[PDB]
């Protein structure tokens, strides 16, 4: 064991020296000669009422008009944001739900939580009703996130320190991803749908290969649990938010950290993060009941979204970049423009 | 507006009516979270998730157990938390005390009361009268402890058992009252795994908790 530990320490030192030779400049000094964004002012356009408990998750549709929300009252709701009409109301067998997803084609939705099962619901079919299509079992801990690749594949993250890829028709796991130490909390898919990243409670992030099933890179810059993660629109970078009260930006081709987003006033954690269409603005949600807008190229606050009475838990930006949606523990949703 | 838009609005109105009915139905029940460790008789108090339902005096109760710093945030709005401890294995009271201290000072649990259940008291009495094990071997302050004068009620047992019980109850209570700011209270009890009067203690404690909540929302206290 001692020889292996010494070899591991030597390899870690070699890696640390290797990524120190690539740090010739800094993102802060490269972007001094660019105009600042300015002041960003946004106002509430719609308010969505109907939930009678806290809201844990939401996801936009690819048409930028439909969205789905999850609440502890035990129901899923599909909204029409243009007219604030309710399209569907799906009761759930278990009321402990922590995530939800919407298929790119628009035919299925998914949800899961403290029961350790991910369920698939068929939206459009005969008989005019919505019924359960598939239940996927095999995890040992609670589910935290799930995203659709197509109508027959899905990737899940769980609290048993693993991630999985499923085949919906067969209902069996295809690839299992191992290597984390603590609970995995979030994941994000690349635009090309060939890689994805995950953040866990061990204060580290990993980049995975979907087809091969191996781990390529690991990033360690935080000092507490990581709660949120999201890709840059380019596909060569991603951002994370932690209980550190800080956000950080990482690079894939340089394999190190570029920027940090913090201020002395913030002392609370970060629940969700998102980007804009151009990648110039970074949206984050905090426990002090409001949201902050960051300049991703200059590390400066640009605006505040303060309209909620309790904790902000979820966030989302449309594909066309026309609006942003927030949910909170006060049982309301808002659309800002 | 078009005819189809009007029909969609009517469908939304019907959905809203169903949601209101479901919420009104759900408002009646009360939710409890059951926490504890092994060898504590946790599953025999009331005679992923294992649910349990019971009612007393026409009031419905719904109990949950999970079989923890991350998923504990879900139970932020429960009525109470039930903590079960075995009070006969002296080698593990420190672990139970540390667990109780960790659960008492949680950030998301700053407004939830706790109902404490000290289980397996017959074994404790048998061990105390046996004389083969000494509590002072693990808690040296026991030898310098005396039963309170005006607060010493007993049902007809030996003073040694009363002193042993009161020491443990005092440890838990003075951990609870160290720093709570008066926003939530702890309720202790003594049980024996053959007791049948356990669904009424929870009922009385829940009444007291609801009374305090009503008092604070009218600014009386």
């Amino acid at each position, epitope marked *: 064991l001692d020889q292996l530990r010494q070899e591991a320490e030597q390899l870690k030192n070699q890696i640390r020296d290797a990524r120190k030779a690539c740090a010739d400049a800094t993102l802060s000094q490269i972007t001094n000669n660019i105009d600042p964004v300015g002041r960003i002012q946004m106002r509430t356009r719609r308010t969505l009422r109907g939930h009678l408990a806290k809201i844990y998750a939401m996801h936009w549709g690819t048409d930028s008009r439909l969205l789905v929300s999850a609440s502890q009252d035990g129901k899923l709701i599909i909204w029409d944001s243009y007219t604030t*009409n309710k399209v569907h109301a799906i009761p759930l067998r278990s009321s402990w739900v922590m995530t939800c997803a919407y298929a790119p084609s628009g035919n299925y939705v998914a949800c899961g939580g403290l029961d350790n099962i991910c369920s698939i619901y068929n939206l459009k079919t005969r008989e005019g009703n919505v019924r359960v299509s598939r239940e996927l079992a095999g995890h040992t801990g609670y589910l935290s996130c799930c995203r659709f690749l197509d109508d027959n594949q899905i990737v899940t993250s769980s609290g048993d320190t693993t991630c999985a890829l499923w085949d919906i028709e067969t209902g069996q796991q295809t690839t299992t991803f191992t290597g984390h130490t603590g609970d995995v909390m979030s994941l994000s898919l690349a635009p090309d749908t060939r890689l994805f990243v995950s953040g866990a409670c061990d204060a580290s992030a990993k980049l995975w290969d979907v087809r091969e099933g191996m781990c390529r890179q690991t990033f360690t810059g935080h000092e507490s649990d990581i709660n949120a993660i999201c890709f840059f629109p380019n596909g060569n970078a991603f951002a994370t938010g932690s209980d550190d009260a800080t956000c950080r930006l990482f690079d894939l081709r340089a394999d190190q950290e570029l920027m940090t987003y913090s201020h002395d006033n913030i002392i609370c954690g970060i629940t969700s993060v998102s980007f804009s269409k151009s990648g110039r603005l970074l949206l984050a949600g905090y426990d002090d009941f409001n949201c902050n807008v960051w300049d991703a190229l200059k590390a400066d606050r640009a605006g505040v979204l303060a309209g909620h009475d309790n904790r902000v838990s979820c966030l989302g930006v449309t594909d066309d970049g026309m609006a942003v949606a927030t949910g909170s523990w006060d049982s309301f949703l808002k659309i800002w423009n | 507006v078009s005819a189809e838009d009007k029909a969609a609005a009517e*469908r939304s109105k019907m959905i809203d009516k169903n949601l209101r009915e479901d919420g009104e139905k759900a408002r009646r029940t009360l939710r409890l979270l059951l926490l504890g460790a092994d060898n504590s008789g946790k599953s025999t108090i009331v005679k992923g998730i294992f649910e349990t339902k019971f009612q007393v005096d026409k009031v419905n109760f719904h109990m949950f157990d999970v079989g923890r710093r991350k998923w504990i945030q879900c139970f932020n709005d429960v009525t109470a938390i039930i903590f079960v401890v075995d009070s006969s294995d002296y080698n593990r009271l420190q672990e139970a005390l540390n667990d109780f201290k960790s659960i008492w000072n949680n950030r998301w649990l700053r407004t939830i009361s706790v109902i404490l259940f000290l289980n397996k008291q017959d074994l404790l009495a048998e061990k105390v009268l046996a004389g083969k094990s000494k509590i002072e071997d693990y808690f040296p302050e026991f030898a310098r402890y005396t039963t309170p004068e005006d607060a010493t009620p007993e049902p007809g047992e030996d003073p040694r058992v009363t002193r042993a019980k009161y020491f443990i109850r005092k440890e838990f209570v003075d951990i609870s009252t160290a720093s709570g700011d008066g926003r939530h209270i702890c309720y202790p009890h003594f049980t024996c795994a053959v007791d049948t009067e356990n669904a009424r203690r929870i009922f009385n404690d829940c009444k007291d908790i609801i009374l305090q909540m009503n008092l604070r929302e009218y600014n009386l206290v």
Partner: single-chain antibody
Amino acid sequence: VQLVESGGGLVQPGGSRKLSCSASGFAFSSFGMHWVRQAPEKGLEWVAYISSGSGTIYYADTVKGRFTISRDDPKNTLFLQMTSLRSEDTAMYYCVRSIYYYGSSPFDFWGQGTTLTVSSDIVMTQATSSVPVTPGESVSISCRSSKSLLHSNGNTYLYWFLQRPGQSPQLLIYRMSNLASGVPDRFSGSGSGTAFTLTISRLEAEDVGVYYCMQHLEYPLTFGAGTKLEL
């Protein structure tokens, strides 16, 4: 999915009858239902409408004050009450299901009909009445309206139906552009305000009959005249 109608028969002028329809195979209580009748040799005509929850009822001016529509959700039955029957009520009646939400496809399923014999508005017409066709070719069918069917929200409300000889009408195109479920891709539909066309590519057998175009912009619902295709 099934829809079976009962009743019908011969009746003297001034009499009364009651028509019934039983549904089995789908969530009946979440659908709105229509009555449509057809004369022995004429086209299609709309009669009445009842909404889910029984909160909205509509009638045509020809039958207002004499006909009544009702439903019984627990038994999954739809009713129509006759009163003061006339010689112009000799037709065969149809029961049609319809559901309304964002992205839905109303007028999906039609049941078989029962025959009853007795002893302003948007005008939209189909100039063509008969076209000879051969297999393996392409045919275009067009009809025009009186006023614009393009709403402010961006939707154009026009529908297409096909009725084969000795059968019940079937939905092809809803809202002027979308294909219904089970319809082969050789059908297409496009048009502008007031002027619409339907295109069939690689015509084959089992695709001969009468085509109808209907508007759904406002009540009452109005059908066309009908263009038939012959070998």
